[PDB]
C-alpha cells in the first residue's frame, strides 16, 4: 500500500521547500490526487495533475525563514500560477524526483491563503443561528443534527465554503439541538480520504464523553446562577499582584473522601458550593489567614475518565486496609482498574472550551456549565480568586479515528507539530500542538477569553509554557487586560498569568521561534516557577538520586549515609544552596546584589546553577513563583521522609515541613503551595500519581490520616525505588498522628497572617528590594544552615525612602535548620528596638516562644528547626 513520508514543505502559495540535490532539483514534478488513488507499479500511477516545479536560484526569502528557522537551508521550488492552489490542498499530494517520493507539510501555505479572523463556532442572532468551521483542506463539510444525546439524526445540511471557512445560516429553532460535523478529508496517516464525524473546536457544551456538541447560547438566563452578572462587585479585593498566594488543588481529591458531602457531589463542581462541609471550612480558614488564589488542576474536557459514572470501577477499601503498610498488594488492585476508575489529573486535552462532564452531576444537559459558575462564585464569596490550569501544549489523540480526536480530525497535520520527516512530535507527552501556526494561536487566545468572560476566571497556569510561543503569551496578556466591567463584566487588569517555563526538545534554543521559556519570559510580567529555590531546599533534583541532600534536608548538618563527598565538600555545597535560596527570597531578581559564600558581591544573574544557567532571571518580583512542591513529583512530607536521616522522629520532620513552607510564605515574590502541605500530605512516596487512583491521592479533612503507609506505590513509575521505600513505610514511627497534622496546620495559618501583617514582605518593584532587603549571615565566617533576612522601612527624622508600614519600621526573619539552638551576633542590627512578632508570642507551639533579642550586641537566639520573625514597632 502507498504510505508516503512527508519531507517536503509548502510554505507560501507559490513556493515549495525541499532538501534535495542541487542537480536532482531539475527533475521535480508535483502530483495531485483528489480521490487519493496513487500507487507504485516502476513510476507513479493514478494521478489527476502533473506539473513541473522550477527550482529557484536565490532560495527561501527572509519572511519564510523567520517563521520556520529549522528549514532555512532548504532548496526553493516555484509553483506555477496555472495551478489552482485552493483545490490541490484538498488532494493527496506528492513531489517526485533515483526515484525519491515524499509528501508535503501544508501549514505554511494554509496560513498564507486561509488565515481567518472572523466568527467561528456558533453565532446567535435574534431570528437565526449560524455555524462556522475552519477546514481549508476539506473536500466537503456537512452538519448532522440530533434531537437529543442518544436519538437518530433529524436533518443533514450542506455548508458553503468561503476562504477556507465552511458556513451555514439556519432558523432560531436550531437552538438547543445536538450536532456533529461530517468532514471528508485526506488523512496522511491512513493515506486515504475518510468521511469523519467530528465535534466543534469552538464548542461551549457537550453531551456524555463528547459524543455530540450542544448548540447552546452561553449568554442564556437559564445558565446563570443568582446574581452572576453582579459578581464583579462580589470578587475579593486585589490591590496588586504582589499580594498573591496560590493554593494548588485537584477537584476530585478535594471531596472524594469527604463524608460530609453527598455521594452525587463527591469529586465534582458541586462540592465547592456546600454550606459547611469539612473541605469548604478548610479553605475558609486559609482564606481568612491571607490566602488569595486557588489553582485547580485541568477542569476542561479531557480524556482518561469516563463521564458516564456507572462504568466506574472501585477498589475494596476495607480489605485493602488489612494489608501491611509496605506491601505491593494495594497497587496491584488499583492498576487492575486504573483505566476505568474515576481518577486522572486531566493532562489529556480534547476540547479546551467545555467543562469536564465527569465533574458534573449529569454529563448531559446544562449541569456542567451552571455548576462550574457556582464553583467560581462560591470561592469568590469566601474570599478566594480562581486560577485554571490550562494545557495548550499538547492534545490527547490524533488521526481520523477515536472519540478523543477532534482538532486533528478536521484539519489533519496542522494543529500538531511535526518533524522534518512528517512524524508527530511527542515531547510534551503526546501529540504536541503548534502554537506558531496562526489558527492554533487564535484558538488559544479565544479560549482564554472564553473562560475569562463566560466563567469569570481570575488567572491561568500554563502547563509547559516553553512549548507555547511567546507571541501567543503576550497577545493573550494584552487581550485579558483590556477587558472592562462595563463592556464584558470582568475587570481584566486583575487577571494574573504564570506557568512552567521549561526549555527542552525540538523547541529549545528558539528552534521553532521565540518560545515561552523562563529566560525569554524575563521582563514580560508573566510568572514562572522558580526551580532553583525548589532544588536548593529539597536537595538534588526530582529526576536525580533520591538520597541527594539539600539545605532543608541536612546536607552537611545531618548526613544520611549516602556518599556526597567529604565534610569540606558538603559544607561548601550547603553554603552554595543557601546563596541560591537567598536570591529567591529576594524575588529571584537579575540585578539584586548579594554577598555569596566566598565573600564576593554578585548580582542574581551572575550567580549560576551548578549545571549552566543563571539563578536570578527576573526583572520584577511578580515574575517569580517560589515553591517546594506541586502535584508533580513527591509531596513535601514524602521527600523529607526519604532524604533526611532515617533515625529521626516524625515530630522533627514535622518541623522541617514547616520550614520549607514558611520560606515560601515569607519570600519576596509569589508563594505557591501544594494542597496538603499544611496537613502533612503523603502519597506513600509516589512520584507520578496521575493515574494512581483515589487510594494514593487521598486528602483527609477529618485529619485522622495523612495517607502515609498505604502500600508501595504503582510499579511502572516507582518499582525501582521500592527497596528504599519499603522499610520507611513499614516503620510505625514514620506515620504521624492526629496531633501532628493539626499542629502543622495551625503553624501554617500563623505564618500566612505574619506575611499580611506587613507590606514589607510584599515589595512590588525590583528597586524596592535592592534598597530594603539585606542578608546578614554571609561570607566565609557564616554560621551554616542559618539565613538571616532583614527588611528596612522609612525611620527616624527625614528618611531616604518612603513609608510603607504603619506599624513596623524594620522586620528581621531568621531561618534555622540546625538540630540545636543558635546564638547570632549581628553588629548592624544592634541598639535597635526589636521584639518577637505578636503572632509567635501567642503561638500554640511552646518551642517558638523561647525566641529572644538583645539590644546590646544585636543577639538573635532562635530555637532549633525553627523560623522566627522579629519586628521593630513604631
Amino acid at each position: 500500500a502507498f504510505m508516503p513520508d512527508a519531507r517536503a514543505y509548502w510554505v507560501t502559495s507559490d513556493l515549495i521547500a525541499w532538501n534535495v540535490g542541487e542537480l536532482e532539483a531539475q527533475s521535480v514534478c508535483l502530483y495531485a490526487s483528489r480521490a487519493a488513488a496513487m500507487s507504485l507499479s516502476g513510476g507513479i500511477q493514478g494521478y489527476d495533475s502533473k506539473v513541473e516545479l522550477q527550482p529557484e536560484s536565490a532560495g527561501l526569502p527572509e519572511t519564510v525563514t523567520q517563521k520556520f528557522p529549522f528549514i532555512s537551508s532548504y532548496r526553493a521550488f516555484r509553483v506555477p500560477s496555472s495551478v489552482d492552489v485552493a483545490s490541490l490542498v484538498k488532494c493527496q499530494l506528492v513531489v517526485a524526483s533515483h526515484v525519491d517520493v515524499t509528501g508535503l507539510q501544508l501549514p505554511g501555505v494554509l496560513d498564507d491563503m486561509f488565515a481567518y479572523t472572523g466568527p467561528l463556532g456558533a453565532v446567535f442572532s435574534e431570528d437565526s443561528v449560524s455555524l462556522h468551521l475552519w477546514a481549508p483542506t476539506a473536500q466537503g463539510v456537512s452538519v448532522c443534527f440530533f434531537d437529543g444525546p442518544a436519538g437518530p439524526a433529524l436533518e443533514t445540511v450542506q455548508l458553503k465554503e468561503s476562504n477556507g471557512v465552511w458556513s451555514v445560516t439556519g432558523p432560531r429553532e436550531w437552538e438547543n439541538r445536538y450536532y456533529l460535523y461530517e468532514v471528508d478529508v485526506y488523512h496522511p496517516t491512513k493515506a486515504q480520504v475518510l468521511k469523519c464525524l467530528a465535534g466543534d473546536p469552538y464548542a461551549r457544551s457537550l453531551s456524555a464523553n463528547g459524543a455530540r456538541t450542544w448548540l447552546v447560547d452561553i449568554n442564556n438566563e437559564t445558565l446563570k446562577p443568582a446574581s452572576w452578572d453582579e459578581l464583579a462587585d462580589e470578587k475579593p479585593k486585589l490591590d496588586s499582584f504582589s499580594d498573591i498566594t496560590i493554593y494548588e488543588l485537584h477537584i476530585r481529591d478535594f471531596s472524594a473522601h469527604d463524608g460530609t458531602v453527598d455521594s452525587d457531589s463527591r469529586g465534582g463542581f458541586r462540592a465547592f458550593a456546600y454550606q459547611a462541609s469539612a473541605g469548604m471550612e478548610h479553605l475558609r480558614k486559609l482564606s481568612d489567614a491571607g490566602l488569595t488564589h486557588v489553582h485547580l488542576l485541568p477542569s476542561f474536557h479531557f480524556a482518561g475518565v469516563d463521564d458516564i459514572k456507572s462504568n466506574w470501577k472501585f477498589v475494596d477499601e476495607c480489605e485493602l486496609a488489612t494489608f501491611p503498610p509496605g506491601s505491593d498488594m494495594q497497587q496491584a488492585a488499583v492498576v487492575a482498574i486504573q483505566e476505568e476508575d474515576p481518577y486522572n489529573w486531566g493532562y489529556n486535552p480534547v476540547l479546551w472550551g467545555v467543562p469536564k462532564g465527569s465533574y458534573a452531576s449529569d454529563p448531559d444537559g446544562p449541569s456542567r456549565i451552571i455548576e462550574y459558575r457556582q464553583m467560581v462564585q462560591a470561592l469568590n464569596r469566601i474570599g478566594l480568586r480562581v486560577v485554571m490550569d490550562v494545557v495548550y501544549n499538547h492534545l490527547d489523540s490524533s488521526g481520523p479515528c477515536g472519540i478523543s480526536s477532534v482538532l486533528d480530525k478536521i484539519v489533519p497535520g496542522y494543529y500538531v507539530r511535526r518533524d522534518t520527516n512528517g512524524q508527530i512530535e511527542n515531547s510534551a507527552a503526546m501529540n504536541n500542538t503548534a502554537s506558531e501556526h496562526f489558527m492554533v494561536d487564535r484558538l488559544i487566545v479565544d479560549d482564554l477569553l472564553n473562560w475569562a468572560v463566560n466563567y469569570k476566571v481570575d488567572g491561568f497556569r500554563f502547563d509547559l509554557m516553553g512549548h507555547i510561543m511567546k507571541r501567543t503569551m503576550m497577545r493573550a496578556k494584552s487581550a485579558l487586560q483590556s477587558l472592562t466591567t462595563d463592556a464584558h463584566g470582568v475587570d481584566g487588569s486583575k487577571i494574573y498569568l504564570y506557568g512552567e517555563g521549561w526549555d527542552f526538545a525540538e523547541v529549545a534554543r528558539n528552534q521553532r521561534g521565540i518560545n515561552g521559556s523562563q529566560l525569554n519570559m524575563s521582563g514580560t510580567g508573566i510568572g514562572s516557577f522558580n526551580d532553583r529555590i525548589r532544588d536548593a531546599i529539597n536537595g538534588g533534583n526530582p529526576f536525580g538520586n533520591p538520597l541527594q541532600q539539600g539545605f532543608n534536608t541536612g546536607l552537611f548538618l545531618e548526613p544520611n549515609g549516602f556518599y556526597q563527598g567529604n565534610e569540606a565538600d558538603t559544607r561548601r555545597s550547603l553554603a552554595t544552596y543557601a546563596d541560591q535560596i537567598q536570591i529567591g527570597l529576594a524575588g529571584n531578581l537579575r540585578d539584586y546584589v548579594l554577598i555569596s559564600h566566598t565573600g564576593e558581591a554578585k548580582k542574581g544573574s551572575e550567580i549560576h546553577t551548578f549545571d549552566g544557567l543563571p539563578v536570578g532571571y527576573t526583572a520584577s518580583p511578580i515574575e517569580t513563583i517560589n515553591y517546594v512542591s506541586a502535584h508533580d513529583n513527591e509531596t513535601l512530607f514524602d521527600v523529607i521522609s526519604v532524604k533526611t536521616p532515617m533515625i529521626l522522629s516524625v515530630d522533627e520532620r514535622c518541623r522541617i515541613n514547616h520550614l520549607a513552607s514558611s520560606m515560601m510564605a515569607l519570600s519576596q515574590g509569589i508563594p505557591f503551595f501544594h494542597a496538603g502541605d499544611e496537613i502533612l500530605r503523603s502519597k506513600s512516596i509516589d512520584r507520578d500519581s496521575y493515574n494512581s487512583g483515589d487510594w494514593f491521592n487521598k486528602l483527609d479533612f477529618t485529619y485522622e490520616t495523612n495517607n502515609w503507609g498505604v502500600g508501595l506505590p504503582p510499579s511502572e513509575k516507582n518499582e525501582d525505588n521500592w527497596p528504599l521505600m519499603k522499610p520507611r513505610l513499614e516503620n510505625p514511627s514514620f506515620k504521624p498522628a492526629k496531633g501532628h497534622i493539626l499542629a502543622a496546620l495551625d503553624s501554617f495559618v500563623d505564618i500566612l497572617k505574619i506575611r499580611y501583617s506587613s507590606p514589607l514582605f510584599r515589595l512590588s518593584t525590583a528597586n524596592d528590594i535592592k534598597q530594603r532587603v539585606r542578608f546578614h549571615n554571609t561570607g566565609p565566617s557564616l554560621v551554616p544552615g542559618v539565613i538571616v533576612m532583614g527588611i528596612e522601612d522609612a525611620r527616624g527624622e527625614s528618611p531616604e525612602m518612603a513609608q510603607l508600614d504603619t506599624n513596623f519600621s524594620y522586620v528581621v526573619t531568621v531561618f534555622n535548620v540546625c538540630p540545636h539552638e543558635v546564638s547570632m551576633d549581628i553588629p548592624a542590627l544592634a541598639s535597635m528596638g526589636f521584639e518577637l512578632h505578636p503572632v509567635q508570642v501567642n503561638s500554640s507551639d511552646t518551642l517558638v516562644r523561647k525566641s529572644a533579642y538583645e539590644a546590646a550586641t544585636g543577639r538573635f537566639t532562635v530555637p532549633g528547626r525553627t523560623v522566627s520573625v522579629f519586628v521593630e514597632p513604631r
Binding site: 527542552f504 533534583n541 529526576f543 536525580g544 538520586n545 556526597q564 549545571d611 507520578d688 525501582d720
Partner: protein, 101 residues
C-alpha cells in the same frame, strides 16, 4: 586529573542514571524528553577533557581506598541487566542523543 568534586560535581550524572532506566527498562517518570534534556545539560556542563571520565563514573563508579564503590554505578534492575544498561549509556554522547564531543 578529572576528580569528582573538583572538576565536576559528586554523583556526576544522577539524572542520566534515571534516563537510562526509562529508555532501557521502560520504567520511570513521565515526560521522558524533559529528563533527557537535564541529562544532556549535566553532560555538557562537564569540561570536554573530563566528559569521558564522568561518563565512566556513571557506568562503573569510583572505588574508594576503603574498597567500595560510591559515585556510581549502573546496577541490576528487574528484567533489566547491567550490560544492557551499560551499552546505551555509552551512546549518550552520540549524534542521535545529546550530541557532545
Amino acid at each position: 586529573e578529572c576528580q569528582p568534586g573538583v572538576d565536576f560535581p559528586h554523583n556526576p550524572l544522577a539524572t542520566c542514571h534515571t534516563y537510562v532506566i526509562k529508555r532501557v527498562c521502560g520504567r520511570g517518570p513521565s515526560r521522558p524528553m524533559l529528563v533527557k534534556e537535564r541529562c544532556c545539560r549535566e553532560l555538557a556542563a562537564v569540561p570536554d577533557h573530563c566528559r569521558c571520565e564522568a561518563l565512566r563514573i556513571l557506568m562503573d563508579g569510583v572505588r574508594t581506598p576503603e574498597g567500595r564503590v560510591v559515585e556510581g554505578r549502573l546496577g541490576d534492575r528487574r528484567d533489566c541487566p547491567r550490560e544492557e544498561q551499560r551499552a546505551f549509556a555509552a551512546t549518550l554522547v552520540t549524534a542521535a542523543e545529546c550530541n557532545l564531543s
